[PDB]
């Protein structure tokens, strides 16, 4: 009967120990040869056998899919090994001594009555909630902090082998640019990051570090390769996952690829030259080119835009670059002006796009290259109204040979001082922010700084130039189109403002001077640099 039982506890049910698909292993009924009391201890013992059967049945069935489920069952047999081994010995002792009884079996298997009923619910949570993917590495971890020492020493082994899969995939991606996966288990799926499957104890900070160190290889298409493989393999031997060490291997790998990427991003591929191109054309750095382009391509934009004006300007811009004695077949065809038509003055839709090369494709995305365009739209407008305004002055002095016609310059100069010095704080926010962007580059050998220094440099331009500040941007905008009306009024005639021109002249001064002092209350962070220039002679102080 002893060898009969030792098989029942192995997974083989018989006549004495019937098997039921719902309840589990249990004794059939009373027996003469056994004592009528011992039937209870067997039923308590069979609570141990029912687990092992339901274990090995699940292990073989493999059920759901995924490597992290395959490896879990692969490891689940390792913790189960001492149970099989400690069962083989019971045959040894019983073979020798012919007087032992069932009570001795209960003494040897005391700890296993404590290890299985706790690890059992770990399996039940998986088959009852469809836990798929890396979420197992948390569901098993949330139960690894239990109080029972053996349970803690058991699941830690399973987590130690389950990490071997992640460590296999993680090293395969961080150095070969490809992710070996066909079931969306890894937390990476132009790649992205996953949060709804990311482990619990892993912080998002290192997760971001992983996403960058890999994409920097896949896009990129010696000794810095094998040595890290030994480091990753070393962690696979650690019987305890220590986050404090997981970061010391990632950050070194991160700093090495970043140091290697910075070398190419600046030295081999000259970023300074390319930034110099952007500052000149986008941010109106080469203003001498745009005043001639505005001089030529003027009549062909005040009319509403049509399907033909897109080519009518590219030739004008090309006629311009040669008109400023600049000759360079490089970077000349790379600048293509765009006309936002069919989804209205023509200037409102003008823009300049830039076909970036291959190396800087990562640094200049369509997002960052769009905020640049918005600056070019606004900065051109100020340049347009300023060049237009001064031409009127070029006519007043040219009109030297009415007691009311003198009100023109008494308004023109006011409209001049507010506008000319408005183009200041621009040559002192560009040549100041840009001078920091260029200094943050030649300082840090790291490349990660450039992606942030350049990003912060761009956000400052939108903030410093009051483009994002709605109230001031909606008041000065009224000043912009205001000068268009005034300058036209002086140019649309050649005599004194008598035919309802003066009647129209006094209209704007009631609004302009109101708009002027309205702005003054707004300024009363960064406006101090601007308001100081307008207030040098304290004209607004008397206003």
């Amino acid at each position: 009967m002893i060898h009969e039982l030792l098989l029942a506890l192995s997974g083989y049910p018989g006549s004495i120990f019937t098997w039921n698909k719902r309840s589990g292993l249990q004794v059939s009924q009373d027996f003469p040869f056994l004592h009528p009391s011992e039937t209870s201890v067997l039923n308590r013992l069979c609570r141990l056998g029912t687990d092992y059967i339901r274990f090995t049945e699940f292990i073989e069935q493999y059920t759901l899919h995924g490597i992290y489920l395959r490896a879990f069952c692969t490891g689940l047999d390792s913790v189960l090994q001492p149970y099989r081994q400690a069962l083989l010995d019971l045959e040894q002792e019983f073979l020798g001594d012919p007087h032992l009884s069932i009570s001795h079996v209960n003494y040897f298997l005391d700890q296993f009555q404590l290890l299985f009923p706790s690890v059992m619910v770990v399996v039940e949570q998986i088959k009852s909630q469809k836990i798929h993917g890396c979420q197992i590495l948390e569901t098993v971890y949330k139960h690894s902090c239990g109080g029972l020492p053996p349970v803690r020493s058991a699941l830690e082994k399973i987590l130690a082998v389950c990490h071997g899969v992640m460590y296999k995939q993680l090293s395969a991606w961080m150095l070969h640019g490809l992710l070996l996966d066909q079931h969306e288990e890894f937390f990476i799926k132009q790649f992205s990051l996953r949060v709804e499957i990311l482990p619990s104890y892993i912080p998002v900070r290192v997760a971001e570090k992983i996403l960058f160190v890999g994409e920097s290889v896949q896009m990129f298409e010696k000794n810095q390769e094998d040595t890290f493989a030994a480091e990753l393999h070393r962690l696979k031997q650690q019987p305890l996952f220590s986050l404090v060490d997981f970061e010391q291997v990632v950050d070194r790998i991160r700093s090495t690829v970043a140091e290697h990427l910075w070398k190419l991003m600046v030295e081999e591929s000259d970023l300074l030259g390319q930034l110099k191109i952007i500052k000149d054309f986008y941010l109106l750095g080469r203003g001498e080119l745009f005043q001639a382009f505005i001089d030529t391509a003027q009549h062909m934009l005040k009319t509403p835009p049509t399907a033909v004006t897109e080519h009518d300007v590219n030739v004008a811009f090309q006629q311009s670059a040669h008109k400023v004695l600049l000759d360079d077949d490089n970077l000349l065809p790379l600048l293509h002006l765009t006309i936002e038509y069919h989804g209205a003055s023509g200037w409102a839709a003008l823009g300049l796009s830039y076909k970036v090369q291959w190396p800087l494709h990562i640094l200049f995305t369509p997002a960052v290259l769009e905020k640049y365009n918005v600056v070019f739209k606004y900065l051109l407008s100020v340049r347009r109204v300023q060049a237009e305004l001064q031409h009127c002055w070029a006519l007043q002095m040219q009109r030297k040979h009415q007691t009311d016609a003198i009100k023109w310059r008494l308004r023109n100069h006011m409209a001049f001082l507010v506008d000319n010095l408005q183009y200041y704080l621009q040559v002192d926010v560009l040549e100041s922010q840009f001078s920091q962007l260029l200094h943050q580059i030649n300082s840090t050998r790291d490349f990660e700084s450039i992606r942030l220094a350049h990003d912060h440099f761009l956000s400052n331009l939108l903030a410093q130039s009051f483009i994002l500040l709605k109230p001031v941007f909606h008041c000065l905008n009224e000043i912009l189109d205001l000068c268009h009306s005034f300058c036209s009024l002086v140019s649309q005639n050649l005599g004194p403002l008598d035919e309802r021109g003066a009647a129209q002249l006094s209209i704007l001064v009631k609004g302009f001077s109101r708009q002027s002092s309205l702005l003054f209350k707004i300024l009363s962070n960064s406006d101090l640099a601007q308001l100081l220039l307008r207030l040098d002679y304290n004209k607004y102080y008397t206003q």
Binding site: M1, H3, E4, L6, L7, A8, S10, Y12, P13, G14, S15, I16, R84, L87, L88, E91, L95, A172, H176, L180
Partner: protein, 484 residues
């Protein structure tokens, strides 16, 4: 009910015999290719039922080893692939049966019972279960090319699922199964001919993705080698294993098959420079048309089909052809002559009008119509010949001198006509644009003979303005002439 009441140790020797791969056993008597336990077996213990249970599990393993032995039997008693597969399968059993016969030694000469031999055979009954699933896909199937491709492809897929002792088995089972293909591939490369049996290979002179990422470099090397003679690869993959499995590891096999390819294609192009030369045969083709042809056409200005021949050897017709040997026939195809003839016809009509209005030297009012027209035709001729028939020509020569392939030389060539037939507007939009240039060319014919005047400028100023007001739609290269 009677029972045989067998002893205990006898059962173990039975299982060792059954797992060995023999038949006709007192226990596990098969009936229909399915091993099944007897019904009268009983020991002093195990209540006659657990024995039927424990034997049933081992019987399930006998089925896996009996079916495989039936498979090896149906091969012994020129596919050259199953032979490479069974020899790998048979090689496993010898390294396995030794583990079985060794156990029987310790039985005749330490206590041994059932629960010990099973646990001792755990790392074997695990490896055996895999074969029941790998072979299940190699038995469930009629042509010899689908039975071998689907088998060899199942292995390369089944290993990537297992990416340690189970991987070492499938890998050692893979190499001995891909040995036939790796042989014929090498044999096709160096010996320049494909030596296949029963059309086993996939190229029947439906595809295994094993060698797909480099397949193009094989065929383009095989066929290229065959045209050369008319004018140990497996022993390299295995040493690679001596010095991240089967996906990156396999990515180191191709350097053996790629460098070998690079020599072959580089050899054909090398011997194609002289001795069935091509660079001098190609340039002279685009030279005898597109000086020499100056005197030829002038004789046609002032007919007979034989008259021209003696002239050449010295309205839209004059089909010209050429003689091409076989080593270059594949490059300059038959449908390639017509395109070269196509642009030759149109080019001459431009030389015609240009020469007709230049050979000569309200009375002087005709001259204001001369410069107003002689310039226009002269402008168009400067566009076709110089900035088209010499731009792409200057680039084409710089490209052929770097030819490194039999195929790509066709592509770089075919990417020269199909573009020169597009820039020179002759393919499409003929009745929309090309006809305009065609009808104004008739003004070069009418005005040439007469040597009505007021009615020419009314037409000329109309069609010329019709020409610009139609071409104004500009695809972008048309602006090089749109100035006039």
């Amino acid at each position: 009910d009677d029972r045989v009441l067998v002893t205990e140790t006898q059962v173990i020797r039975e299982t060792l015999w059954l797992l060995s791969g023999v038949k006709k056993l007192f226990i596990f008597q098969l009936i229909d290719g399915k091993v099944t336990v007897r019904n009268n077996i009983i020991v002093t213990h195990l209540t006659h039922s657990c024995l039927r249970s424990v034997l049933e599990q081992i019987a399930a393993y006998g089925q896996v080893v009996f079916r495989l032995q039936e498979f090896i039997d149906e091969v012994m008693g020129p596919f050259r692939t199953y032979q490479a597969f069974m020899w790998a399968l048979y090689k496993y059993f010898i390294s396995f049966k030794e583990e079985l016969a060794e156990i029987e030694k310790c039985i005749i000469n330490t206590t041994i019972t059932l629960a010990i031999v099973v646990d001792k055979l755990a790392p074997r009954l695990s490896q055996l279960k895999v074969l029941h699933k790998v072979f299940s896909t190699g038995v469930a199937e009629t042509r010899n090319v689908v039975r071998a491709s689907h088998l060899l492809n199942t292995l390369y897929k089944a290993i990537l699922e297992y990416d340690e002792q189970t991987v070492s088995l499938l890998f050692s089972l893979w190499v001995e199964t891909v040995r036939p293909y790796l042989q014929t591939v090498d044999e096709w490369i160096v010996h320049g001919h494909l030596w296949d049996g029963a059309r086993e290979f996939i190229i029947q002179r439906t595809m295994v993705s094993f060698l797909k990422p480099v397949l193009k470099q094989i065929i383009m090397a095989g066929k290229s080698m065959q045209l050369l003679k008319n004018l140990e690869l497996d022993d390299v993959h295995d040493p690679l294993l001596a010095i991240t499995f089967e996906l990156t590891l396999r990515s180191c096999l191709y350097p053996h098959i790629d460098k070998q390819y690079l020599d072959c294609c580089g050899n054909l192009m090398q011997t194609l420079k002289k001795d069935y030369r091509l660079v001098e045969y190609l340039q002279a083709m685009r030279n005898f048309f597109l000086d020499t042809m100056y005197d030829f056409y002038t004789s046609i200005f002032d007919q007979n089909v034989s008259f021209l021949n003696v002239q050449l050897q010295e309205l839209d017709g004059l089909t010209l052809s050429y003689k091409v040997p076989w080593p270059v026939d594949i490059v300059i195809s038959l449908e390639c002559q017509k395109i070269y003839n196509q642009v030759f016809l149109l080019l001459l009509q431009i030389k015609w009008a240009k020469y007709s209005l230049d050979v000569l030297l309200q009375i002087h009012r005709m001259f204001l119509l001369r410069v107003k027209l002689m310039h226009f035709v002269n402008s168009l001729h400067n566009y076709i010949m110089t900035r088209i028939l010499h731009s792409t020509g200057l680039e084409f020569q710089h490209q052929v001198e770097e030819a490194k392939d039999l195929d790509q030389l066709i592509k770089i060539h075919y990417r020269y006509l199909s573009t020169i037939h597009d820039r020179c507007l002759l393919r499409e939009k003929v009745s929309f644009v090309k006809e305009a240039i065609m009808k104004v060319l008739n003004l070069a014919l009418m005005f040439a003979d007469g040597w009505s005047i007021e009615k020419m400028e009314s037409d000329f100023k109309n069609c010329h303005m019709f020409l610009v007001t139609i071409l104004n739609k500009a695809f972008p290269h048309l602006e090089s002439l749109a100035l006039s």
